[PDB]
């Protein structure tokens, strides 16, 4: 029933733009919406990837590998899945494994790859693939993992046991001002609810 | 180590603005970041998203989702019920209210997250994730009455919790739809648990 009629540029930065979207509502009436888009999406199936990295080690409980970084939009530190935009020509899988190694030092193995999923669909068209990766933490490659941050990236790695993830996130939030990401919280909630 | 120095308004709509954020990198180098904010926040967070667990005896437990045309996405999305928190509304009350408006179900609060970030590389947007159970055998939830506000148009899709990820994949394959990343993350962790 509903569809886009037009998209008028309001303001375009280097990285993000704002658009006035005109669409057809299901009663047959024309309405508008203010929409955010990135300027960086070419032929990628999504803007970015986020990596669910499952660290597996003999005689250890499985951990979820997370990263903490300062996020200027939020004006503070956030705890997130490792993530980055997909480079032109790059596969989501390749991007996931590259970002995971850049941000954490770990060399993972692909487990699964989601379809393109929407970040905040009332606000923006931004999409990611959520890529599940296992890390063989008994491999010597993953013994002394050193992040390779790119220019203007400072990332801290936080590995938390899967079997206690939500409580461990709560204890981090109780101890300093930081924000957990909604996807991480959602995943930690489901682990509890299961 | 890192912090905001200044914020420069680039463009302000009715519902969203774009800013250029100046911040101090941890080396002591000054850097810029294009950021989106909502103009509507006054609140613990911008919004709530509700995880609605529909419990009916002798049936599988379901998670109740909503499908809506999302103009920034140009298409239909499958999401947790959700909306912005009204000025002077608590997240809990926002959750029950949005759930009722979007689904017609009347639910009970189970737990409530802290404010969690939606896309912290892009925006300052935050929600509370609110877990709500729905007693689907109570008379008030027998024939659930959805109350769409002006120009909301919401389809309710209930999916079994114990097969959620495969059911969502199925919808994406048959119906050219975009699943929400928080939905998808929850579904993944239901599979990944234990
Ligand atoms: C017809 C439904 N109306 C809404 O819920 N709003 C949401 C805010 N929005 C934006 C971002 O431009 C305009 C309309
Ligand atoms: C060199 C470290 N900084 C970055 O990676 N960014 C992110 C993209 N961007 C935005 C949204 O404004 C500015 C540069
Ligand atoms: Cl529950
Ligand atoms: Mg990143
Ligand atoms: Mg990176
Ligand atoms: Mg809504
Ligand atoms: Mg509503």
Residue B11 belongs to what H/E stretch?
strand B3-12
Provide the token pair at A167: 């409580």
Give the DSSP letter of residue A43.
Answer: S
What span, in angstroms and rounded, lies between the C-alpha atoms of A66 and A79?
7
Contacts of B167 in chain A (CB under 8 A): none
Using alpha carbons, select from A118, A26, A30 the residue that is nearest to residue B152.
A26
Phi and psi for A180 in degrees, rounded to 5?
Answer: -90, 145
- Is A139 strand, coil or helix? coil
Token pair 């005896």 in the structure block, residue: B57
A31 lines ligand 1 (CB under 6 A): yes
Torsion angle in degrees (nearest 10) through CA of B124, B130, B131, B136: -130
Give the torsion sign (CA, B123, B124, B125, B128): positive
What span, in angstroms and rounded, lies between the C-alpha atoms of B111 and A172?
18
The resolution in angstroms reads 1.6
CATH number assigned to the domain covering A1-194: 3.90.79.10
A residues 125..184 contacting B (CB < 8 A):
125-128, 130, 132, 152, 154, 162, 173, 179-184
Q: Where are the alpha helices (DSSP H) in B105-180?
A: 164-175
Produce one character per residue of A146-164: b if its CB has 16 or more CB atoms within 10 Å, e if not. Answer: ebeeeeeeebebbbbebee
Centroid of chain to Cα B189 = 17
How distant is the Cα of A72 from the closest Cα of chain B, in angstroms?
6
Question: B2-10, long-range: CB within 8 Å, 24+ apart, which pairs?
Answer: B2/A70, B2/A77, B2/A154, B2/B26, B3/A70, B3/A75, B4/A72, B4/A75, B5/B30, B7/B35, B10/A11, B10/A13, B10/B34
Measured CA angle at B68 (ends B66, B70), to 5 deg: 135
- B72 CA closest ligand 1 atom index: 11
Query: Helix B164-175 vs helix B181-192: angle between axes, to the nearest 10 degrees?
Result: 140
- Is B94 strand, coil or helix? helix
What span, in angstroms and rounded, lies between the C-alpha atoms of A61 and A59?
7
What span, in angstroms and rounded, lies between the C-alpha atoms of A95 and B153?
36
B15 lines ligand 1 (CB under 6 A): yes
What span, in angstroms and rounded, lies between the C-alpha atoms of A49 and A179?
20
Token pair 């939020």 in the structure block, residue: A74
Region of residue A188 (phi > 0: left; psi between -120 and 50: alpha; otherwise: beta): alpha
What span, in angstroms and rounded, lies between the C-alpha atoms of B84 and B97?
11
What span, in angstroms and rounded, lies between the C-alpha atoms of A37 and A15?
9
Q: Are A117 and B4 in contact (CB < 8 Å)?
A: no
What span, in angstroms and rounded, lies between the C-alpha atoms of A166 and A135?
21
Phi and psi for A130 in degrees, rounded to 5?
Answer: -95, 115
Contact call for residues A166 and A188 (beta carbons, < 8 A): yes
Produce one character per residue of A38-75: b if its CB has 16 or more CB atoms within 10 Å, e if not. Answer: beebeebebbbbbbbbbbeeeeeebbbbbbbbbbbbbb
Experimental approach was: X-ray
- Is B110 strand, coil or helix? strand
Residues forming a β-bridge with B65: B157
Contact call for residues B48 and B38 (beta carbons, < 8 A): no
Using alpha carbons, select from B35, B182, B70 the residue that is nearest to residue A70.
B35
Q: Are A189 and B126 in contact (CB < 8 Å)?
A: no
Contact call for residues B21 and B7 (beta carbons, < 8 A): yes
What span, in angstroms and rounded, lies between the C-alpha atoms of A163 and B12?
44
Residues forming a β-bridge with B66: B79, B156
Contact call for residues B161 and B60 (beta carbons, < 8 A): yes
Residue B15 burial class via C-beta count within 10 angstroms: exposed 0-12, middle 13-18, buried 19 and up? middle
Other beta carbons less than 10 A from residue B146's beta carbon: 17
What span, in angstroms and rounded, lies between the C-alpha atoms of B111 and B95?
11
Token pair 């912005």 in the structure block, residue: B84
What span, in angstroms and rounded, lies between the C-alpha atoms of B15 and A91?
34
Using alpha carbons, select from B94, B109, B99 the residue that is nearest to residue B41.
B94
Find all residues with CB under 8 Å of A27, minimum gap 6, and list them.
none
């Amino acid at each position: 029933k509903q569809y886009i009629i037009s998209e008028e540029l309001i303001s375009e930065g280097k990285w993000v733009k704002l658009e006035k979207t005109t669409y057809m509502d299901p009663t047959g009436k024309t309405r508008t919406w203010e929409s955010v888009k990135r300027t960086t999406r070419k032929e990628q199936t999504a803007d970015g990837v986020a990596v669910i990295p499952v660290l597996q080690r003999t005689l250890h409980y499985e951990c979820i590998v997370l990263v903490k970084q300062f996020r200027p939009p939020m004006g503070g530190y956030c705890i997130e899945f490792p993530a980055g935009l997909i480079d032109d020509g790059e596969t989501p899988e390749a991007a996931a494994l590259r970002e995971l190694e850049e941000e954490t030092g770990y060399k993972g193995d692909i487990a699964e790859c989601s379809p393109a999923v929407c970040m905040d669909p009332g606000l923006s068209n931004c999409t990611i693939h959520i890529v599940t990766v296992t890390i063989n933490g008994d491999d010597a490659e993953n013994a002394r993992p050193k992040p390779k941050p790119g220019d203007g990236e400072f990332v801290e790695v936080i590995s938390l046991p899967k079997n206690d993830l939500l409580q461990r996130l709560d204890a981090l939030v109780a101890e300093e001002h930081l924000t957990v990401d909604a996807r991480v919280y959602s995943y930690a909630l489901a682990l509890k609810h299961a």
